[PDB]
CSV table of C-alpha atoms in Angstrom, one decimal:
chain,number,residue,atom,x,y,z
Q,1,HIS,CA,103.0,12.6,207.3
Q,2,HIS,CA,104.4,10.7,204.3
Q,3,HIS,CA,107.8,9.7,205.7
Q,4,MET,CA,110.3,8.8,203.0
Q,5,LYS,CA,114.1,9.3,202.5
Q,6,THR,CA,114.1,12.3,200.2
Q,7,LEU,CA,116.6,11.7,197.4
Q,8,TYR,CA,116.3,15.1,195.5
Q,9,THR,CA,114.5,18.4,196.0
Q,10,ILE,CA,114.0,21.3,193.5
Q,11,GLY,CA,112.3,24.6,193.9
Q,12,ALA,CA,110.5,27.1,191.7
Q,13,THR,CA,109.0,30.6,192.2
Q,14,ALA,CA,106.0,32.1,190.6
Q,15,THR,CA,105.3,35.9,190.5
Q,16,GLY,CA,103.7,38.5,188.3
Q,17,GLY,CA,100.0,37.9,188.9
Q,18,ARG,CA,97.8,37.4,186.0
Q,19,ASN,CA,100.7,38.0,183.6
Q,20,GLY,CA,102.8,35.5,185.4
Q,21,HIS,CA,106.4,34.5,185.5
Q,22,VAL,CA,108.0,31.2,186.8
Q,23,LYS,CA,111.7,30.5,187.5
Q,24,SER,CA,113.3,27.4,188.9
Q,25,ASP,CA,115.7,28.0,191.8
Q,26,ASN,CA,118.7,27.4,189.5
Q,27,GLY,CA,117.4,29.3,186.5
Q,28,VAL,CA,117.3,26.2,184.3
Q,29,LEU,CA,113.6,26.8,183.7
Q,30,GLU,CA,112.4,30.5,183.3
Q,31,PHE,CA,109.5,31.8,181.3
Q,32,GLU,CA,106.2,33.6,181.1
Q,33,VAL,CA,102.9,32.0,181.9
Q,34,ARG,CA,99.5,33.4,180.7
Q,35,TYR,CA,95.9,32.3,180.6
Q,36,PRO,CA,95.3,30.6,177.3
Q,37,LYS,CA,92.6,31.8,174.9
Q,38,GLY,CA,90.2,29.1,175.9
Q,39,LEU,CA,90.3,30.3,179.5
Q,40,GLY,CA,89.7,33.9,178.5
Q,41,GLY,CA,93.3,34.9,177.8
Q,42,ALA,CA,94.7,37.0,175.0
Q,43,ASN,CA,96.3,34.3,172.8
Q,44,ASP,CA,97.9,30.9,172.9
Q,45,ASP,CA,101.5,32.2,172.7
Q,46,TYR,CA,102.6,31.3,176.2
Q,47,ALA,CA,102.9,28.4,178.7
Q,48,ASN,CA,100.5,27.8,181.5
Q,49,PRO,CA,100.3,25.4,184.5
Q,50,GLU,CA,98.1,22.9,182.6
Q,51,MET,CA,100.8,22.7,179.9
Q,52,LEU,CA,103.5,22.3,182.5
Q,53,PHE,CA,101.5,19.4,184.0
Q,54,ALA,CA,101.3,17.7,180.5
Q,55,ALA,CA,105.0,18.2,179.9
Q,56,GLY,CA,105.9,17.0,183.4
Q,57,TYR,CA,103.6,14.0,183.4
Q,58,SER,CA,104.7,12.8,179.9
Q,59,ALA,CA,108.4,13.1,181.0
Q,60,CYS,CA,107.8,11.4,184.3
Q,61,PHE,CA,106.0,8.5,182.7
Q,62,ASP,CA,108.5,8.1,179.9
Q,63,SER,CA,111.4,8.2,182.5
Q,64,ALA,CA,109.7,5.6,184.6
Q,65,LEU,CA,108.9,3.4,181.6
Q,66,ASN,CA,112.6,3.5,180.5
Q,67,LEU,CA,113.7,2.5,184.0
Q,68,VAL,CA,111.3,-0.4,184.0
Q,69,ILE,CA,112.5,-1.5,180.5
Q,70,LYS,CA,116.2,-1.3,181.6
Q,71,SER,CA,115.5,-3.2,184.8
Q,72,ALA,CA,113.9,-6.0,182.7
Q,73,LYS,CA,116.8,-6.1,180.2
Q,74,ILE,CA,114.1,-6.1,177.3
Q,75,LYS,CA,115.0,-4.8,173.9
Q,76,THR,CA,112.7,-2.1,172.6
Q,77,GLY,CA,112.8,0.8,170.3
Q,78,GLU,CA,112.8,4.4,171.6
Q,79,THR,CA,109.6,5.0,173.5
Q,80,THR,CA,107.2,7.9,173.2
Q,81,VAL,CA,104.6,9.2,175.8
Q,82,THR,CA,101.9,11.7,175.2
Q,83,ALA,CA,99.9,13.4,178.0
Q,84,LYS,CA,96.7,15.4,177.3
Q,85,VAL,CA,95.5,17.5,180.2
Q,86,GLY,CA,92.1,19.1,180.5
Q,87,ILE,CA,90.9,21.6,183.1
Q,88,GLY,CA,87.3,22.3,184.1
Q,89,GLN,CA,85.2,23.5,187.0
Q,90,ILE,CA,84.5,21.0,189.8
Q,91,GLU,CA,81.8,20.8,192.4
Q,92,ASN,CA,83.0,23.3,195.0
Q,93,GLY,CA,83.6,26.0,192.5
Q,94,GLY,CA,87.3,25.2,192.2
Q,95,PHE,CA,89.0,23.7,189.2
Q,96,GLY,CA,90.2,20.2,188.5
Q,97,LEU,CA,92.3,18.2,186.0
Q,98,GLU,CA,91.7,15.2,183.8
Q,99,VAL,CA,94.5,13.3,182.0
Q,100,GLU,CA,94.9,10.9,179.0
Q,101,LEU,CA,98.2,9.2,178.8
Q,102,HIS,CA,99.4,7.1,175.9
Q,103,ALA,CA,102.7,5.2,175.6
Q,104,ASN,CA,104.2,3.7,172.5
Q,105,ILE,CA,106.8,1.0,172.8
Q,106,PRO,CA,108.3,-0.2,169.5
Q,107,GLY,CA,109.5,-3.8,169.1
Q,108,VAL,CA,107.6,-5.6,171.8
Q,109,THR,CA,104.4,-7.7,171.9
Q,110,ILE,CA,101.2,-6.2,173.3
Q,111,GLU,CA,101.4,-8.4,176.4
Q,112,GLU,CA,105.0,-7.1,177.1
Q,113,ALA,CA,103.8,-3.5,176.5
Q,114,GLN,CA,100.9,-3.9,178.9
Q,115,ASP,CA,103.2,-5.3,181.6
Q,116,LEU,CA,105.7,-2.5,181.1
Q,117,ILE,CA,103.2,0.3,181.4
Q,118,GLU,CA,101.5,-1.3,184.4
Q,119,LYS,CA,104.8,-1.2,186.2
Q,120,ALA,CA,105.7,2.3,185.0
Q,121,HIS,CA,102.3,3.6,186.3
Q,122,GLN,CA,103.4,2.4,189.8
Q,123,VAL,CA,106.9,4.0,189.5
Q,124,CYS,CA,106.0,7.4,188.1
Q,125,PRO,CA,105.5,10.0,191.0
Q,126,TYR,CA,102.8,11.9,189.0
Q,127,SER,CA,100.8,8.7,188.8
Q,128,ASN,CA,101.2,8.1,192.5
Q,129,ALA,CA,100.3,11.7,193.3
Q,130,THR,CA,97.0,11.7,191.3
Q,131,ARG,CA,95.6,8.2,191.8
Q,132,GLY,CA,92.1,8.1,193.2
Q,133,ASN,CA,91.6,11.9,192.7
Q,134,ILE,CA,91.5,12.6,188.9
Q,135,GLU,CA,90.8,10.5,185.9
Q,136,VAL,CA,94.0,9.1,184.2
Q,137,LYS,CA,93.2,7.1,181.1
Q,138,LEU,CA,96.3,5.1,180.2
Q,139,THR,CA,96.7,3.1,177.0
Q,140,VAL,CA,99.7,1.6,175.2
Q,141,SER,CA,100.6,0.8,171.6
Q,142,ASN,CA,103.5,-1.2,170.1
Q,143,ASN,CA,104.1,0.7,166.7
D,1,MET,CA,83.3,17.7,184.3
D,2,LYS,CA,82.8,20.3,181.5
D,3,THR,CA,86.3,20.6,180.1
D,4,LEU,CA,87.2,24.3,179.4
D,5,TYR,CA,90.7,23.8,177.9
D,6,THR,CA,93.0,20.9,176.9
D,7,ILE,CA,96.7,20.9,176.1
D,8,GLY,CA,99.0,18.0,175.2
D,9,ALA,CA,102.7,17.3,175.4
D,10,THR,CA,105.0,14.5,174.1
D,11,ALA,CA,108.1,13.1,175.7
D,12,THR,CA,110.7,10.9,173.9
D,13,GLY,CA,114.4,10.8,173.2
D,14,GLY,CA,115.6,7.8,175.4
D,15,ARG,CA,118.7,8.8,177.3
D,16,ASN,CA,118.5,12.2,175.7
D,17,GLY,CA,115.1,13.0,176.9
D,18,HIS,CA,113.1,15.7,175.1
D,19,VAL,CA,109.6,17.2,175.8
D,20,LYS,CA,107.5,19.3,173.5
D,21,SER,CA,104.0,20.8,173.9
D,22,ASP,CA,101.5,20.1,171.1
D,23,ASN,CA,101.8,23.8,169.9
D,24,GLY,CA,105.6,24.1,170.3
D,25,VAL,CA,105.3,26.8,173.0
D,26,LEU,CA,107.3,24.6,175.4
D,27,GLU,CA,110.2,22.5,174.0
D,28,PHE,CA,113.2,21.4,176.1
D,29,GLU,CA,115.5,18.6,177.1
D,30,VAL,CA,115.3,16.6,180.3
D,31,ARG,CA,118.0,14.6,182.1
D,32,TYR,CA,118.4,13.1,185.5
D,33,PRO,CA,119.8,15.6,188.0
D,34,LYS,CA,123.1,14.8,189.8
D,35,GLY,CA,121.3,13.8,193.0
D,36,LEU,CA,119.4,11.0,191.1
D,37,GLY,CA,122.6,9.7,189.4
D,38,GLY,CA,122.7,12.1,186.4
D,39,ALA,CA,125.8,13.9,185.0
D,40,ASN,CA,125.0,17.5,186.2
D,41,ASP,CA,122.2,19.9,187.2
D,42,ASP,CA,122.0,21.8,183.9
D,43,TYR,CA,118.7,20.3,182.7
D,44,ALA,CA,115.0,20.3,183.6
D,45,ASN,CA,113.4,17.2,185.0
D,46,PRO,CA,109.8,16.2,185.9
D,47,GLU,CA,110.2,17.2,189.5
D,48,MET,CA,111.2,20.7,188.4
D,49,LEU,CA,108.2,20.9,186.0
D,50,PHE,CA,106.0,19.9,188.9
D,51,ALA,CA,107.5,22.7,191.1
D,52,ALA,CA,107.1,25.3,188.3
D,53,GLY,CA,103.5,24.1,187.5
D,54,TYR,CA,102.4,24.0,191.1
D,55,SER,CA,103.8,27.4,192.1
D,56,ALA,CA,102.2,28.9,189.0
D,57,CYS,CA,98.8,27.1,189.5
D,58,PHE,CA,98.7,28.2,193.2
D,59,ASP,CA,99.7,31.8,192.5
D,60,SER,CA,97.1,32.0,189.7
D,61,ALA,CA,94.4,30.6,192.1
D,62,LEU,CA,95.5,33.0,194.8
D,63,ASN,CA,95.2,36.0,192.5
D,64,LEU,CA,91.7,34.9,191.3
D,65,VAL,CA,90.6,34.6,195.0
D,66,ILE,CA,92.0,38.1,195.8
D,67,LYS,CA,90.3,39.7,192.8
D,68,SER,CA,87.0,38.1,193.5
D,69,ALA,CA,87.1,39.7,197.0
D,70,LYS,CA,88.3,43.1,195.7
D,71,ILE,CA,91.1,43.0,198.3
D,72,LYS,CA,94.1,45.2,197.7
D,73,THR,CA,97.4,43.5,198.1
D,74,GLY,CA,100.9,43.8,196.8
D,75,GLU,CA,102.3,41.5,194.1
D,76,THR,CA,102.2,37.9,195.5
D,77,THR,CA,105.0,35.3,195.3
D,78,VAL,CA,104.6,31.5,195.6
D,79,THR,CA,107.4,29.0,196.0
D,80,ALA,CA,107.1,25.3,195.6
D,81,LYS,CA,109.9,22.9,196.7
D,82,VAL,CA,109.3,19.4,195.4
D,83,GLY,CA,111.1,16.4,196.8
D,84,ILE,CA,111.1,12.8,195.4
D,85,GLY,CA,111.8,9.6,197.3
D,86,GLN,CA,111.0,5.9,197.2
D,87,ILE,CA,107.6,4.9,198.6
D,88,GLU,CA,106.0,1.6,199.6
D,89,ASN,CA,105.1,0.1,196.2
D,90,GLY,CA,108.8,0.3,195.2
D,91,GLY,CA,108.0,3.3,193.1
D,92,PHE,CA,108.6,6.9,193.8
D,93,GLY,CA,106.5,9.7,195.3
D,94,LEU,CA,106.6,13.5,195.7
D,95,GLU,CA,106.4,15.9,198.7
D,96,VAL,CA,105.8,19.6,198.5
D,97,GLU,CA,106.6,22.7,200.6
D,98,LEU,CA,104.3,25.4,199.2
D,99,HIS,CA,104.7,29.0,200.5
D,100,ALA,CA,102.9,32.1,199.5
D,101,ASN,CA,103.8,35.7,200.3
D,102,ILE,CA,100.9,38.3,200.2
D,103,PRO,CA,102.1,41.8,200.9
D,104,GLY,CA,99.9,44.4,202.5
D,105,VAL,CA,97.4,42.2,204.4
D,106,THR,CA,97.3,40.8,207.9
D,107,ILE,CA,98.5,37.3,208.6
D,108,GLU,CA,94.9,36.2,209.3
D,109,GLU,CA,93.8,37.6,206.0
D,110,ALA,CA,96.6,35.9,204.2
D,111,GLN,CA,95.8,32.6,205.9
D,112,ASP,CA,92.2,32.9,204.7
D,113,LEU,CA,93.3,33.7,201.2
D,114,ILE,CA,95.7,30.7,200.9
D,115,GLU,CA,93.0,28.3,202.3
D,116,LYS,CA,90.7,29.4,199.6
D,117,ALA,CA,93.4,29.2,196.9
D,118,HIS,CA,94.2,25.6,198.0
D,119,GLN,CA,90.6,24.6,197.1
D,120,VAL,CA,90.7,26.4,193.7
D,121,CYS,CA,94.1,25.3,192.3
D,122,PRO,CA,93.8,22.1,190.2
D,123,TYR,CA,97.2,20.8,191.4
D,124,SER,CA,96.0,20.9,195.0
D,125,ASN,CA,92.8,19.2,194.1
D,126,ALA,CA,94.6,16.5,192.0
D,127,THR,CA,97.1,15.6,194.7
D,128,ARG,CA,95.2,16.0,197.9
D,129,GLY,CA,95.7,13.1,200.3
D,130,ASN,CA,98.3,11.4,198.2
D,131,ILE,CA,101.3,13.6,199.0
D,132,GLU,CA,102.2,15.9,201.9
D,133,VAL,CA,101.8,19.6,200.9
D,134,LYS,CA,103.1,21.8,203.7
D,135,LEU,CA,101.3,25.1,202.9
D,136,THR,CA,102.3,28.3,204.7
D,137,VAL,CA,101.9,32.0,204.2
D,138,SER,CA,103.7,35.3,205.0
D,139,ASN,CA,102.8,38.9,204.6
D,140,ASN,CA,106.2,40.6,203.9
């Protein structure tokens, strides 16, 4: 039991089996999902849950990074975050993820950049949700 | 781990957040929802991406489990409801209500299927023990 004061909740529904469909409760997100070619699918034309995880994690981390920057009143350029998500088979026959995250923070020193991403990595819910379970390699640049 | 597939995405845009997968298949804007101080509820956000991804991951795993057993069912549905709140480090954490519906089976069969799916789905494996995932099943 992870008791917290819930600030916001959002739902989504998945249907359609192998040729899947996902829709947020409010319709803001709605699209097809399919297995990608590298997992035995027909093509790479559609989204999949691994891609949704990369999209969500990159956005979560960039949002947390910008909150940390604004809280510190530090001048930076516009930040960028990339998330690369891999899937493979794990020990029980299930499947698991691995993640590489990279942030770029223009206009700061590397010490500042490192401090900022360290804090962002504690703020981001995706980082808190995955810590200890999967590999999350996190690096920062200041280009 | 022997990696079978990898996919990337990039987020940028500052106050006008934008996310794009490496291949352009997903590209959309993100903003804070009203409940977290944002202007409205017209945009995606990372909580919504997690709900979409988890529901799809779990439904995919469930269908793989069903097919491996050659069990006849109706079309399944999975809902994921994702909450966010402040946690002990001063940062923020998720919580999930995950519900599957499996038509055409007994509730005991459905429970067995979701228990197996919860070991297959990468989102379940990645988050286990770090967030509460209330997992239930129906057979409507």
